[PDB]
């Protein structure tokens, strides 16, 4: 019966994020010499050129982490991350200008990524 003003009494259970969407694990390496931190909702293929990973596996995807959180890569660090699928219309505009339309245009995305030196186009 001690009263903490405004306290919560949360229900039981847990919240599943991004439920129903395909998940994919990939390895990613920061080949640069400065830290790179990546937010939950950035189209994954458009992250910093010096992150090395299979760029194709980042198309149409973002990190499967709670909304508003991020994954950190110290210089030289390699680790695995889990991705989820983008939703809505599955279109991306801006950011690094690799997509500017549907995420279904993989060849175009990769071509642009390759030309601009985004590491890991295979």
């Amino acid at each position: 019966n001690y009263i903490v003003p405004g306290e919560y009494r949360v229900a039981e259970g847990e919240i599943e994020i991004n439920a129903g969407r395909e998940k994919t694990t990939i390895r990613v390496s920061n080949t640069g010499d400065r830290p790179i931190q990546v937010g939950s909702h950035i189209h994954f293929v458009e992250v910093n050129k010096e992150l090395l990973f299979d760029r194709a596996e980042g198309i149409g995807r973002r990190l499967n982490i709670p909304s508003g959180t991020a994954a950190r890569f110290e210089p030289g660090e390699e680790m695995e991350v889990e991705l989820t699928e983008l939703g809505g219309n599955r279109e991306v505009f801006g950011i690094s200008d690799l997509t500017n339309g549907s995420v279904d245009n993989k060849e175009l995305i990769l071509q642009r990524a390759k030309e601009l030196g985004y590491k890991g186009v295979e």
Partner: protein, 100 residues
């Protein structure tokens, strides 16, 4: 005196702390704004005394204890923040979870 706007405002905090200290001295358990006022004035006076920001982050956690305040007050105060003129100019002090 050449009082600026912050100097005028901050006189209010000193006053509120003096009020609260009188209330504590006559045996009352202090409430939320009373507790905040006492801790805040302590930080500002400490800056004036020439203490460091790090000293005040530490000391501000020992100015009031739970038995000094009403039920729930400790948990209502997540932190207390104050800016004051140290010997090396204005700095921000944040006392985290001041009352356990």
């Amino acid at each position: 005196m050449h009082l600026n706007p912050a100097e005028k405002e901050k006189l209010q905090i000193f006053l509120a702390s003096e009020l609260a200290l009188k209330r504590k001295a006559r045996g009352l358990k202090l409430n939320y704004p009373e507790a905040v006022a006492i801790i805040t004035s302590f930080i500002m006076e400490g800056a004036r005394d020439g203490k460091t920001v790090a000293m005040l982050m530490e000391e501000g956690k020992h100015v009031l204890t739970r038995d000094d305040v009403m039920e729930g007050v400790p948990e209502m105060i997540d932190d207390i923040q104050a800016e004051a003129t140290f010997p090396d100019g204005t700095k921000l002090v944040t006392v985290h979870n001041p009352i356990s």
